[PDB]
Structure formats: structure tokens, C-alpha cells
């Protein structure tokens, strides 16, 4: 009851009892042919964009508020998919995201894993503006805080308002999955391309945001490990660019 999956020259292993969320019922696909027939011809890499990219693990401790990543540009240094971001003026893609934990039966805790489109964030100063570095750091995660933040140009990252001004118990409206250390330790989310235009430039726009948020904190006792590792793996799907010839 273990499946082994190979994309390109990558191989990972999952359990065949996985559960998969397809975001709004829609699988990813190519914009078919004839939105812009004449002088808008696209191309597709399909070479080493369809392959598993694995980020660094994060460390879940007793007081961890949460983590977030921006897509794309979490992959702007990831081999070929990142090269294509510099060579081409427009693009699009869907994604498959796997999130996994490594824990024992003597640990306990609960995580929400959610993919949020257009996650526009607020500044720590009400009459201020957010910086580009405070929104993302690429393949390194940003951190939520457990109290309200200060300083100039920083996202106001108190975890109960999720940086967007809503109640964090209501983020289940988005494509999401629960990880309860008692019953499962994995989550797969398949995201299609969602925009109000068919293609776009991939450097000054963040299509979506992946967030991981503990709702019940990690607990252990006498001589268990004091942390739990979380691992994120991403495979781009049906990527497509403007033709160069």
C-alpha cells in the first residue's frame, strides 16, 4: 500500500490511500487554441518543468505561528522552470502540491493547509505601504506572528487575521486540507491557473499563496523529539509561454 511516482528524473513515494482536492472541480489544461489565433502563438516546455521540486523542510515546534509562500517566484531559482521565467515575456501554469509531516503516535497537533488566490496583504502601518521583500523571500518561507507587528513596510502578520483582514477560522472557503496527526500526515492540492486574463507576466504578479497554519499546537512529552518536520513538493502542470519565432 505504497505508490512510487516518477516525473522526469525525479522520484517520490506516497501512500495509495491519499486524498486529493481538485481546487474548484477543474483540472489544469492548455488554453485550447483560438482565443488569439493570428499573432499570438504559444509554446510549451514539457521538458523539465514537469518534475518534482522539493523545497527545504520547515520545523514545527511548540510555538510556531505559521508559514506562507508565494507562487510563482518560489520557483524562480528552480532549474528550468526558473530559466523560462526570464526568457519568456508571458506564461501560465497549474500545480500539484504535496505536503507531508514526519511524526510519531506519541505526538499530537492539527494543521490547516490552504491555497489562496490573490492574497493581497496589509501593512503594519495603516497609512503605509508594503515592501517587496516583506511579501516574499523566494523559496524561504515568511512567518506569521502571534502578536501584532510593527516596523515600516512590513506585512501586518498577526496570525488571527492572516494578513488579509479576515477571521482565520473562515479560510475554509478556499481550497484547503486538514492534517490531524492522529489520523493522517499528508495533503495533496491540485491548483489550476486562475486569472482574469489568459496569460500574464510572472514577475510582478503573485497568482496564489500557499499557507500552513497550526490550529492546535504541537505537544509531546518526556523524551520524544522536540520538533516535527514538514516537507513541500511542487510539480508544475501544463505550462505554456509566448512563442519566440
Amino acid at each position: 500500500r505504497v505508490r512510487s511516482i516518477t516525473l522526469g528524473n525525479s522520484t517520490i513515494t506516497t501512500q495509495e490511500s491519499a486524498n486529493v482536492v481538485v481546487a474548484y472541480g477543474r483540472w489544469p489544461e492548455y488554453l485550447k487554441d483560438n482565443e488569439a489565433t493570428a499573432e499570438d502563438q504559444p509554446t510549451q516546455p514539457d521538458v523539465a518543468t514537469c518534475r518534482f521540486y522539493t523545497l527545504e523542510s520547515v520545523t514545527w515546534e511548540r510555538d510556531s505561528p505559521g508559514w506562507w509562500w508565494k507562487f510563482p517566484d518560489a520557483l524562480k531559482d528552480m532549474g528550468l522552470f526558473g530559466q523560462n521565467m526570464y526568457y519568456h515575456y508571458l506564461g501560465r501554469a497549474g500545480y500539484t502540491i504535496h505536503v507531508q509531516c514526519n511524526a510519531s503516535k506519541f505526538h499530537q497537533g492539527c494543521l490547516m493547509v490552504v491555497c489562496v488566490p490573490e492574497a493581497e496583504m496589509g501593512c503594519s502601518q495603516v497609512d503605509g505601504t508594503v515592501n517587496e521583500h516583506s511579501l516574499s523571500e523566494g523559496e524561504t518561507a515568511k512567518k506569521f506572528a502571534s502578536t501584532s507587528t510593527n516596523g515600516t513596510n512590513t506585512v501586518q502578520s498577526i496570525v488571527t487575521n492572516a494578513g488579509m483582514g479576515v477571521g482565520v477560522g473562515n479560510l475554509t472557503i478556499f481550497p484547503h486540507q486538514w492534517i490531524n496527526l492522529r489520523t493522517n500526515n499528508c495533503a495533496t492540492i491540485v491548483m489550476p491557473y486562475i486569472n482574469n486574463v489568459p496569460m500574464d507576466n510572472m514577475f510582478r504578479h503573485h497568482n496564489f499563496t500557499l499557507m500552513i497554519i497550526p490550529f492546535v499546537p504541537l505537544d509531546y512529552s518526556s523524551d520524544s523529539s522536540t520538533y516535527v518536520p514538514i516537507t513541500v513538493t511542487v510539480a508544475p502542470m501544463c505550462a505554456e509561454y509566448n512563442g519566440l519565432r
Binding site: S57, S104, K105, Y220, D223, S224, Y227, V228, P229
Partner: protein
């Protein structure tokens, strides 16, 4: 200085246990060949 592929393993999360279980542990590796393996030019072995 090989020109060969490599394999590596990384801690994504860390190991988590309840109270009363051993702290450290171990992994084991097994190797084998798949059906499409071929060999040529019998020679002498360098071990005896």
C-alpha cells in the same frame, strides 16, 4: 570527479515520538539490478 549521478536525503520535519519510546533510530538500504542488465568482456577480478 566521477561524472555519475547522486542520491541525497534530507530532514523535512524531524522525528516526533510519544512518552516512553526510544529517541534515536536507523535506516537501511538495499540494492539490486533490474531485468535489463548486460555485461561484456569477461576478465579477472581484482579481489583475490
Amino acid at each position: 570527479y566521477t561524472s555519475a549521478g547522486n542520491v541525497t536525503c534530507w530532514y523535512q520535519t524531524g522525528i516526533v515520538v510519544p512518552a516512553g519510546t526510544p529517541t534515536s533510530c536507523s535506516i537501511m538500504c538495499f540494492v539490486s539490478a533490474c531485468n535489463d542488465f548486460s555485461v561484456r568482456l569477461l576478465k579477472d577480478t581484482p579481489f583475490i
